[PDB]
Amino acid sequence: IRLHTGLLLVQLCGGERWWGQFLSNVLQELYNSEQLLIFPQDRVFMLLSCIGQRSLSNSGVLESLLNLLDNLLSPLQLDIPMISWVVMLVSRLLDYVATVEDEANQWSFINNFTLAHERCISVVQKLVLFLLSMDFTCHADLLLFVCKVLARIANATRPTIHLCEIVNEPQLERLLLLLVGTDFNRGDISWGGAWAQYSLTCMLQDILAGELLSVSQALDARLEVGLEQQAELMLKMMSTLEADSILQALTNTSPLSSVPMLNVCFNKLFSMLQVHHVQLESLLQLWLTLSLNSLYNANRIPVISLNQASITSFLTVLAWYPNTLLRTWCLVLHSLTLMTNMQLNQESTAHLLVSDPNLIHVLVKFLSGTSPHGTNQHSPQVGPTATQAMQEFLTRLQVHLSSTCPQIFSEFLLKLIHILSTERGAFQTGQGPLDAQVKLLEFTLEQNFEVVSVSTISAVIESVTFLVHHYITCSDKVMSRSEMTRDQLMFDLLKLVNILVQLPLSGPAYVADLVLANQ
């Protein structure tokens, strides 16, 4: 009878102008923490959800409820249950609104119009104030849920709200430090768990994106004797048409960019990860996700523009810190592809980042594949996806600075070759990603080496010749038979040195004389 009176009233008084205020009133006085009356809050509340679903056609309901919210968290210029039910209820309302819009996916982990701008701003900033003051008395599920409804309302308001009018520098700073620093994000009890961090990232990406747009026909046969059969059949047909009417009635319904301050905040964060107060991996992954949403592609320009101090801090902390997993190596490589796609605001950024030797050291660490924690050092390959990303990375570097100076980069790459083949190097001992090595060397083959210094080419050729000679002479005593292997790598290196010796010598003399002189 509750559902039935609800459906009658929604089909009669649903369109009432006081309907939203009436709903706000009854919701306020039924569920109060001071309300001692015992009633099935769950069933009547879901019924309330259903009648609000029918009443969505009326516009005043949403305004009245957010007005109740505005008057509700006024003591935060706290009764957690009031907020919990009402936010889940409005979440259901927004979910049905979203499905209606879709039929005419970021939120899929839960389901198994125009609004006044100022009051929307007021209620959202009050919600943010509620977010920043969360102790043990509140829990994570309500937090993630209020964040999700926040994202939904933010997308709902026309025009979409921007972060400049939402937070200032201290609030954003507090948000980033709670989100990323390793003083609050240590171990498995990282804030609200993984579901919570994922939702926080989800809301952040959506807000930035918004900123940047019958019955059987049977009857008793024995009654045919009397003349009153017509009475029963007319009663039956009235009754069944009425039943149809009732099902029809039930089924039918009732007819100013924040980017500069954001960059400042990230620069502050990079300056604070030096004191080992922030985990690097979470920062980089979140940054690349926030920059990437504008599928991965090397041609995607990141929205977030970084700083020189940022890259210098990043490289020095990675160079100092050893034993970074393959997961974070691929993430780092992806982030470096993205910064290579970036320009800086006039010497190029790629030349500056390549110039210092900490890049040399990190690339050496990556390609050496030591893995000191590897109980399963069977195949040190990093996998084709990472190698292909590395190929795109080197291609981006080459295509961006080939116009200005490929020669200095050629000298750097030869320095990498020399260090990877020097005494106690990775290549001789055979560790490190074989696929990455063959891909880098084959990509190296296609480069032009016109004005490379004689000293470094001589050093690399002597080193590789000594290494390969000691390898061939001291070759293995057995060979097993049952595809790429290191034999192709030696073949490719000798092909490269063949390319090298075919070059005329810069002041038509050739380098063949130089390699001849060193006996």
Binding site: F109, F136, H139, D183, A194, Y198, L295, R327, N376
Partner: protein, 764 residues
């Protein structure tokens, strides 16, 4: 440097032959061979300050171990460790937000234990395969013979891996991945598999180096950190010796969002440390607790985490340390009383100890308590900080009543009667009269009335002087207050001395006689049919005293019994309404249950009365009352009230003599059960032993039943009808006459002795 390394290792190791075990043992030996505590605590405190500090359970265990000696605690206090740990409390409590499943998760649970998720997803590959791999995704395809394969892939010579991308409809908290190769012919098993995940379903990224899998019948990839993944790409590398794949079944084990170590790393590790500090030695805890007292927000955070559900395993330590700090200083004690009343069972027990422990501040504490209760009751009677005054918990009021009663019983140092003025009595009377009888707060305030009048018989005498007691019309609230307040011995004595029960018995009997006369014909004051059941109920509560039961079995009360029986059997349907008939019949049920309870003289007297009324039964249909009385009165097993006391914990509004807390227990149970049952519901090994205050050093047997015990008390000078039997529980030592006494005769056998069964069978 080395110390920093090893302490960091302890802060990053797991709980329970292990590397952590090895480091723990070597550090233990380091402590064993160390000379003085100063150079061992120095690296420790540099590590906490430099770290915030990373603390694991082995580290907690070591801190407990290194603080075994008294000198260890003394040195800890000397070099200012307690201030730093209190600072750690402030930072940790302020830092981490609760992650426990709250009400929200409960309400979200019904809106729609490792769960498979394989059928729900959709599979694809970067190369067109002749058959789709959805057969692997089935929950359980037939695996009994495995003829060729459930699914297969053919490798081109130029290619060495195949990527199988599973798109799940939604991201799930993946727990473990299991891959089943073709068991019959695993020569086609892939050499290595490289798993890639995507939380967002687009950013696909590798997890680790491809794990070798050739020659494996069961592919298990344990995930140490459970991952929220919406898309997985499985790059299966080419087998060592085959160009084909044989796969049997893929299963996706995980959890949805709502489908010990998680608490230890939080503040409770230092809380247990604090518990060791304040409780391992009770003599050095004082001045260091004083030093640990003025730290900011200690009480607020401590109370907040006590209110948290995480205290369920270790709450005892919390209230013990709270009690100790409260007793240590008066001002902080009053402040924490205020924050626990203005800003649960544990609170009740806190108040119990606060009232009960004897110290110079006890008078100030009870003064503050009386001020609090007066303010709260005044606020309730007239209609932020006042919120605690709006609804004072009735359990707390009963606790105050128990404290007052027991303070009266125990030989207290102060003069407790001095703090109870007549103004408090008048105020309590107005409070009691201000609310109706349906809720229990009135019951609580009249329990307070009973305890104080037990303290002050003259105050009870004054109470008689208000309602015309030295015609008479008393509202139900008056009856409730008198019944509740008369349970104490002095009050029941003055009630007996007053002529009020005699006059109301005579007036009620006259009304019953008049009603019988009216039915059969179809200073005196009358009683209407509405109030007869409540006044009979009033008789039931006041009949709890044994002397009251003895007085009830006299000739002064038998006319009421005869008149009521005649009225409710012979007077068939001044007209009895059916609802009032049911009310008064239940009142008679309770009254007759109370009369025959543990009173042999009353038992035999009522046996005589029942034989008398059955002999004079009309000659032949059984009335409803006689039928139901036969079904009820002498078919129920005799029930007696047991009261238990014990210094140890043992696991409602009652009379204040029963005390409060879980340390004092009170139940009403049939005598057929034995002591083994009541102990069950609650090599040298401590064993619970029952003792009695009358019994001088003999434990009680577990299989020793309660009817025999009641006879033993009656044989050892106990007044007839004493309803509650007190039993204290002790801890004896066990290395790994009483039963032969006659049981109670019971009213049923007493009645059946002189052949009432023949009479009722004739009347049947």
């Amino acid at each position: 440097q080395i110390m920093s390394q090893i302490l960091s290792a302890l802060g990053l190791c797991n709980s329970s032959i292990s590397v952590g075990d090895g480091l723990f043992t070597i550090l233990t030996t380091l402590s064993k061979k160390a000379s003085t505590v100063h150079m061992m605590l120095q690296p420790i405190l540099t590590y906490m300050a430099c770290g915030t500090c990373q603390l694991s359970e082995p580290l907690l265990w070591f801190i407990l171990r290194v603080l075994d000696t008294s000198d260890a605690l003394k040195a800890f206090h000397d070099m200012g460790g307690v201030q730093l740990i209190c600072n750690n409390m402030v930072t940790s409590t302020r830092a981490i937000v609760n992650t426990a499943r709250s009400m929200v998760s409960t309400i979200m649970k019904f809106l729609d234990g490792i769960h498979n998720f394989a059928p729900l997803g959709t599979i694809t590959s970067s190369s067109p395969t002749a058959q789709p791999a959805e057969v692997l995704l089935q929950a359980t395809p037939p695996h009994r013979r495995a003829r060729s394969a459930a699914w297969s892939y053919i490798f081109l010579p130029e290619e060495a891996w195949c990527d199988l991308t599973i798109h799940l409809p939604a991201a799930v908290l993946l727990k473990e991945i299991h891959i089943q190769p073709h068991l019959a012919s695993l020569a086609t098993c892939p050499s290595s598999v490289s798993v890639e995940v995507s939380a967002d379903g687009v950013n696909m990224l590798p997890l680790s180096t491809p794990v070798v899998t050739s020659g494996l019948t069961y592919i298990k990839i344990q995930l140490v950190k459970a991952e929220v993944a919406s898309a997985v790409c499985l790059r299966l590398h080419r087998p060592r010796d085959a160009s084909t794949l044989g796969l049997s079944q893929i299963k996706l084990l995980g959890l949805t969002a709502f489908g010990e170590d998680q608490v230890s790393k939080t503040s409770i590790g230092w809380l247990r440390l604090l518990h060791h500090c304040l409780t391992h030695i009770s003599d050095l805890e004082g001045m260091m607790a004083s030093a640990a007292a003025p730290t900011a927000n200690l009480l607020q955070t401590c109370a907040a985490l006590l209110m948290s559900p995480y205290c369920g395993m270790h709450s005892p330590n919390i209230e013990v340390v709270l009690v100790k700090i409260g007793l240590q200083s008066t001002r902080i004690g009053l402040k924490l009383i205020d924050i626990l009343l203005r800003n649960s069972d544990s609170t009740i027990d806190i108040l119990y100890q606060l009232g009960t422990t004897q110290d110079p501040g006890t008078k100030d504490r009870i003064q503050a308590l009386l001020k609090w209760v007066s303010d709260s009751a005044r606020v309730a009677a007239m209609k932020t900080v006042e919120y605690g005054l709006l609804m004072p918990s009735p359990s707390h009021l009963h606790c105050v009543a128990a404290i007052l009663w027991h303070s009266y019983e125990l030989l207290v140092e102060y003069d407790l009667p001095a703090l109870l003025d007549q103004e408090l009595f008048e105020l309590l009377f107005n409070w009691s009269m201000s609310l109706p009888c349906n809720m229990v707060l009135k019951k609580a305030v009249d329990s307070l009335l009973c305890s104080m009048c037990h303290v002050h018989p003259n105050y009870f005498s004054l109470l008689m002087g208000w309602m015309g007691i030295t015609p008479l019309a008393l509202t139900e609230s008056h009856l409730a207050t008198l019944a509740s307040s008369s349970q104490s011995p002095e009050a029941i004595k003055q009630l007996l001395d007053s002529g009020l029960p005699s006059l109301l018995v005579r007036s009620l009997a006259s009304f019953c006689f008049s009603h019988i006369s009216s039915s059969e014909s179809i200073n005196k004051m009358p009683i209407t049919a509405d109030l007869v059941a409540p006044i009979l109920r009033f008789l039931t509560e006041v009949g709890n005293s044994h002397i009251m039961k003895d007085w009830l079995g006299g000739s002064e009360v038998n006319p009421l019994w005869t008149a009521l029986l005649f009225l409710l059997c012979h007077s068939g349907s001044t007209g009895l309404t059916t609802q009032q008939r049911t009310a008064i019949e239940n009142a008679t049920v309770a009254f007759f249950l109370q009369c025959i309870s543990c009173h042999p003289n009353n038992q035999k007297l009522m046996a005589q009365v029942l034989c008398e009324l059955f002999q004079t039964s009309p000659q032949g249909n059984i009335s409803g009352f006689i039928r139901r009385l036969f079904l009820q009165l002498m078919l129920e097993d005799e029930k007696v009230t047991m009261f238990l006391q014990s210094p140890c914990p043992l696991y409602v509004i009652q009379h204040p003599m029963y005390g409060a807390g879980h340390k004092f227990r009170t139940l009403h149970l049939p005598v057929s059960t034995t002591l083994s049952d009541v102990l069950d519901r609650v090599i040298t090994v401590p064993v619970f032993h029952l003792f009695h205050k009358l019994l001088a050093g003999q434990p009680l047997p577990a299989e020793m039943t309660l009817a025999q015990l009641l006879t033993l008390l009656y044989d050892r000078k106990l007044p007839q009808g004493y309803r509650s039997i007190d039993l204290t529980v002790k801890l004896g030592s066990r290395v790994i006459s009483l039963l032969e006494t006659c049981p109670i005769q019971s009213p049923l056998q007493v009645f059946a002795g002189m052949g009432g069964l023949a009479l009722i069978a004739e009347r049947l």
